[PDB]
Amino acid sequence: SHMSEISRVALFGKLNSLAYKAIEAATVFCKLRGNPYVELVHWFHQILQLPDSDLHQIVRQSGIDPARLAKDLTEALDRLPRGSTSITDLSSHVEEAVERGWVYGSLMFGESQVRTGYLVIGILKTPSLRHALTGLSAEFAKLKVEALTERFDEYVGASPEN
């Protein structure tokens, strides 16, 4: 039944419009490339294609080299398996990141929607997701979750997710 496991419609339904539209864009990109799963690297690459976001600002305020990050994400994308003839699906890590972003957004910040900065915090607080993230770029080892949780507004500045 619909009540055996948490549904994607409920889980992803907690995303704000920027994050959810970027899941959609990531799916379209993933499919064009023939990659078998929509992954964190597709989602983060699509978020960084926008004019601005929490992720842009967190990169800036954390002292990450955004050009290096862009290089690393492009290279990770180019290395994914291609020519998938299977039906595309979402990576388990993308589902898990939304759950952890909901936990921190709703409990730590008292907020009804998950913005991309809460996705970053939820990832950093989960060892398997943090390992996946740094696997995409060693730049993400520069993130400091204690700073990001205590000084969130300073890190996200004038992000449109405000």
Numbering used by the authors: -1 to 160
Paper text:
The type VI secretion system (T6SS) is a bacterial nanomachine for the transport of effector molecules into prokaryotic and eukaryotic cells. The interaction of TagJ/HsiE with the sheath as well as with ClpV suggests an alternative mode of disassembly in which HsiE recruits the ATPase to the sheath.
In this study, we resolved the crystal structure of the N-terminal domain of Pseudomonas aeruginosa ClpV1 and observed structural alterations in the hydrophobic groove. The overall structure of ClpV1-N is similar to that of the Vibrio ClpV-N, with matching secondary structure elements and an r.m.s. deviation of 1.6 Å for 121 equivalent Cα atoms. Both structures possess an N-terminal helix α0 that distinguishes ClpV-type ATPases from other Hsp100 ATPases (e.g. ClpA). The residues lining the VipB binding groove in ClpV-N are partially conserved in ClpV1-N. For example, Ile10 and Phe87 lie at the bottom of the groove. The corresponding residues in ClpV1-N are Phe10 and Leu88. The two aliphatic residues Leu6 and Ala86, which sit at the top of the groove in Vibrio ClpV-N, are replaced by large residues of opposite charge in ClpV1-N (i.e. Arg6 and Asp87). In one of the two ClpV1-N molecules in the asymmetric unit, these residues form a salt bridge across the groove, whereas in the other, they point into the groove. Consistent with the altered conformation of the binding groove, we were unable to obtain a complex of ClpV1-N bound to a peptide corresponding to the N terminus of HsiC1.
